[PDB]
Nucleic acid binder design. Sequence first.
DNA 1: CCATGCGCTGAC
DNA 2: GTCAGCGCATGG
Length: 327
Amino acid sequence: MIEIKDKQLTGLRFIDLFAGLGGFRLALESCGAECVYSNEWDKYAQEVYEMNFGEKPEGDITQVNEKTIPDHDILCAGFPCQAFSISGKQKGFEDSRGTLFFDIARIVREKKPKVVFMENVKNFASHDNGNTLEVVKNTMNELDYSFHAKVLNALDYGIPQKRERIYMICFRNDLNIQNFQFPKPFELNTFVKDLLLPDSEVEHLVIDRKDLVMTNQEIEQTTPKTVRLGIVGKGGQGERIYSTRGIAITLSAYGGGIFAKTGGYLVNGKTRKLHPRECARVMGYPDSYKVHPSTSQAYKQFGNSVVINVLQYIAYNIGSSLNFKPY
DNA sequence: CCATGCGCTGAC
DNA sequence: GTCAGCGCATGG
Ligand SMILES: Nc1ncnc2c1ncn2[C@@H]1O[C@H](CSCC[C@H](N)C(=O)O)[C@@H](O)[C@H]1O
């Protein structure tokens, strides 16, 4: 994450739905906003959340009575994506874990926050010939909100990972917010190689497979793109190796393959997957964030999470729009 | 639970 | 064509 001088969200309360690791919490708090409610049903996720924020999030949002949720100014929600991801089945709203947006909508209908800040995978935008997105848009509008949506790639915001996510910012209509803008992209000055842990701390992650196929030579100059240096097996998900002079591929929650959830990287002559701390870093999490003790659970958590830096820029721009109240 | 080989969709 | 994806299924 980065340092935020002007705390644009000072005095604003927000809720952290589908909390996960609390990325939205890191982002909005860094802007001066106060978290007054969190909800996350996964046992282990609740563990890390509590480990870092000192409170356990409420469980199953589908059973939470909308009316019990504390009044708030900004509702934050990076809802489930398995039902929309390009990597899954794409069953959408007809999937058990694909109807959560309606719970969010049910909550908004009752508490009318000033802002609804949501996030989901890039494929969400084009899913089901845009109807899924349209549904969200129309739902937001009927609730009397503007709807601002855009896919932003983490690589354009200072983090070496090609995580393309759609962000939807909605402002309550009576606020007449006409100046909201998604942050402008800037040059990448950080690469995978710059976030790695010392070799001593990561030897156990080295996999020596006899089927490594060097598809491309390592590169001498750093580049803001994912450079595949080779595959293993059939080169499917979890079986591709990339240059550390480039950027990280998208971290995943239930990803498979020998380099599950992080992908392989050619490091100082060797081939290995990322360590949970490196995943923390690739997601913009500060080194002070305590990762969950179970590696498998930490890999999953980070793969489901958000890039803090991107949220901090957006969160700042939401605050800028809210503060412009001239006579 | 943890590990892994998918095996296809979508974006160009 | 080329190649990457907050995934799935199945083994133990
Ligand atoms: N019905 C439900 N009630 C509460 N939490 C739920 C839920 N269904 C899914 N979730 C949780 O919502 C999350 C979606 S992924 C969101 C990650 C979060 N943005 C972060 O910063 O890490 C997962 O942690 C999942 O366990």
